[PDB]
């Protein structure tokens, strides 16, 4: 059975590759040659968020568009008021090492994850005090890399064991598990409709997973290195990936292959954080050379550079209305650019 | 009122400074090795589902944090980037002369890592008694695994312990040279390796780690206090 198993696998791979090639008529570069370029854009650091101890790995933006949660490996979760720079909460964590943090759309709960293989859920509206430990989402055999909130009761966690799991807060058990990936999953993003989500793993493949069905629909293998950050286009249909190959590639769920790649000869460092502006033109990618580069989604042009950080910009997030971008780096400071 | 929010932020500032004093005064250590390595015994030698194990031990008024990531996937190229703030990485090498080549490969990967290029690593060659008895038996074909051992000889500057067979010291120093060559291949000098000898029962491991951390902090002070 084995020989024809690989034979059929290779035949299906070739068939899908040929179908994708035939599905390509004109590249995104050619069709967008006539569009007006964004040009050089300069954004200043409006707010610097001093107060964190260790290097900062992840951050997230709330639906109120001015409250953000910053996760640092010092063992603290901090909610920063972007408009007024004051700190709303300072959550002490059970484990110092954390690799992700999530802000619920309703704002009632905040989550985090790391090397503990446990997603810690913290509530903010509790009358008993400031912050209390809701419950631990134990069950993962790999280090958690990225967590996002669908609702107040549904959360999806990406762990370093090739498994993506959807957890129910009320029950505290794995509702559904996804094991289609072959490498360590580094990031996941949720579409605005909360019906589809894509997870990037350390296998140069981005897989679209169904929150309800639980089946993997599309796999995008256009990369050549480990994908670190993945995030949807605001339309909820396309997405882009940032890998260690110093190139950013945009994928759409209709074409099922890469549309445009973002790269430069002067960049030899990988991408660890990626996000889109609300219009989607400004693709923000966090590189390893201590700065953030602004990439035009439809033109692949260097619109601008955010060189306000002296260390790796591990995390990057954009407000739900696109008012400003808070970039967190390993210097224990968050810089908000507008 | 926003003034009360500012007061709360100032209280959070005070708390963050108060526990940042503790965070700065404490020292973080990373424990790494292999399945055959005696990292499980080293942890038990320190006395005052989860992917990372935290161990508390203090010697001479200073406390240390060791993190063991044994219960994790072996694909360690990603979570290792989180340990940049760690003062030193404790490496355990099994001297079963073969998992030694894997130990050298892991040491090379750690030393040449971009994020780990500013971190000194402490190497502990555990189970030295097993290596000594194996090389005393003579059935081990150590020359076959490493052809360099055939021509290498014990340096005149060696300091063997009393009651130690000369071939035991020769093999130990050959392993030390094999690790030191990888350590000094880069030649940057930002971080320094600390070869050491240890066994399953050794109460001086804490003292050795204390001395290595002291030397590392001295080098850091030279780097940061305009003294290098």
């Amino acid at each position, epitope marked *: 059975e084995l020989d024809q198993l690989r034979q059929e696998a290779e035949q299906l791979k070739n068939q899908i590759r040929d179908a994708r090639k035939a599905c390509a008529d004109a590249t995104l570069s050619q069709i967008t040659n006539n569009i007006d370029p964004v040009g050089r854009i300069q954004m200043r650091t409006r707010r610097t968020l001093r107060g964190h101890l260790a290097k900062i790995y992840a951050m997230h933006w709330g639906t*109120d568009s*001015r*409250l953000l949660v910053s996760a640092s490996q010092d063992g603290k979760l901090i909610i920063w*008021d972007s408009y007024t720079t*004051n700190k*709303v*909460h300072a959550i002490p964590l059970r484990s110092s090492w954390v690799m992700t943090c999530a802000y619920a759309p309703s*704002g009632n709960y905040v989550a985090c994850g790391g090397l503990d293989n446990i997603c810690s859920i913290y509530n*903010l*509206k509790t*009358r*008993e*005090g*400031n912050v209390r430990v809701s419950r631990e989402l134990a069950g993962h055999t790999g280090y958690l890399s990225c967590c996002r909130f669908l609702d107040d009761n549904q959360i999806v966690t990406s762990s370093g064991d090739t498994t993506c799991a959807l957890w129910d807060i009320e029950t505290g058990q794995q509702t559904t598990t996804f094991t289609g990936h072959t490498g360590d999953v580094m990031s996941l993003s949720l579409a605005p409709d909360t019906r589809l989500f894509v997870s990037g793993a350390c296998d140069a493949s981005a897989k679209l997973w169904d929150v309800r069905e639980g089946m993997c629909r599309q796999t995008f293998t256009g990369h050549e290195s480990d994908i670190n950050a993945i995030c949807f286009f605001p339309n909820g249909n396309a997405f882009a990936t940032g890998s260690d190959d110093a190139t950013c590639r945009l994928f759409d769920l209709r074409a099922d292959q890469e549309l445009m790649t973002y790269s430069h000869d002067n960049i030899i460092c990988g991408i660890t954080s990626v996000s889109f502006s609300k219009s989607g033109r400004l693709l923000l990618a966090g590189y390893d050379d201590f700065n953030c580069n602004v990439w035009d989604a439809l033109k692949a042009d260097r619109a601008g550079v955010l060189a306000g950080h002296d260390n790796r910009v591990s995390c990057l997030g954009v407000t739900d209305d696109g008012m400003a971008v808070a970039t967190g780096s390993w210097d224990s400071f968050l810089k908000i650019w507008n | *009122e*926003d*003034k*009360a*929010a500012v*007061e*709360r932020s*100032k*209280m959070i500032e*005070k708390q963050l400074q108060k526990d940042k004093q503790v965070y700065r005064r404490t020292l973080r250590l990373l424990l790494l090795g292999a399945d055959n390595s005696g990292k499980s015994t080293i942890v038990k030698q320190m006395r005052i589902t989860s992917g990372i194990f935290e161990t508390k031990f203090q010697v001479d008024k200073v406390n240390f944090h060791m993190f063991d990531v044994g219960a994790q996937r072996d694909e360690r190229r990603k979570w290792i980037q989180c340990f940049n703030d760690v003062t030193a990485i404790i490496f355990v090498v099994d001297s079963s002369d073969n998992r030694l080549q894997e130990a050298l490969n892991d040491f090379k990967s750690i030393w040449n890592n971009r994020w780990l290029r500013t971190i000194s690593v402490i190497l502990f060659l555990n189970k030295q008694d097993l290596l000594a008895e194996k090389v005393l038996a003579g059935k081990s074909k150590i020359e076959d695994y490493f052809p360099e051992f055939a021509r290498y000889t014990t340096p005149e500057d060696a300091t063997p312990e009393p009651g130690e067979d000369p071939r035991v010291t020769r093999a130990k120093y050959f392993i030390r040279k094999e690790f030191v060559d990888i350590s000094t291949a880069s030649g940057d000098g930002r971080h320094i390796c600390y070869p050491h000898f240890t066994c399953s029962v050794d109460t001086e491991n804490a003292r050795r780690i204390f001395n290595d951390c002291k030397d590392i902090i001295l080098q850091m002070n030279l780097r940061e206090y305009n003294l290098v």
Partner: single-chain antibody
Amino acid sequence: VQLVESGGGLVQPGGSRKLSCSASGFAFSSFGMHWVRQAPEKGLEWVAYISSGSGTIYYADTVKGRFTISRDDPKNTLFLQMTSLRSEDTAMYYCVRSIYYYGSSPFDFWGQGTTLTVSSDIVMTQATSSVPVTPGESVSISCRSSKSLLHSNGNTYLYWFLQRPGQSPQLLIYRMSNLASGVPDRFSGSGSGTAFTLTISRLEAEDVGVYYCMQHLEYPLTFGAGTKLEL
């Protein structure tokens, strides 16, 4: 979350009494405490406040110097010092919780209180002290302020309270737009900055009481006269 007060009764005008408010369950350190007095057959009035961690301390103009308030976190007890009780110093004293940030609901919890008897600033005026309204039909309560409470940041510091007969006041709506925790969504509020109106879609027998309006834009925190609903 529970607030109980100790001490009180009848005190001579020149006598001194130690008013204590003990905190149980919730974290006393992170929650500020106000003192609000309720003199008979009239409205509320703020007395004193201490910020979190025994920080900023404010006093009402009437009680500056004469009364001093103290905080002591480890035993979770709030202390209020009475030196000389005047004729107007007799009132129902309430221990009030408070924490300030976005999405916070200060003044949500009010203590039971203890009886104490004796042997420009923003002022509130209400449309009418008594509004006889039958259960079920909508209820509208309006209040006025000396100047606009709309701070330049973009929010109004207007707080609404409901005091059932024989019960501590309960916060209904804070900042004129956000409902409190546990309050039914029937309550609604609106205002142009200088004039405020509180609308209730349906009124039940359990919602009868006296309605109080409060400002937090600038100290002192003066309360309204109090609108009572009759069925």
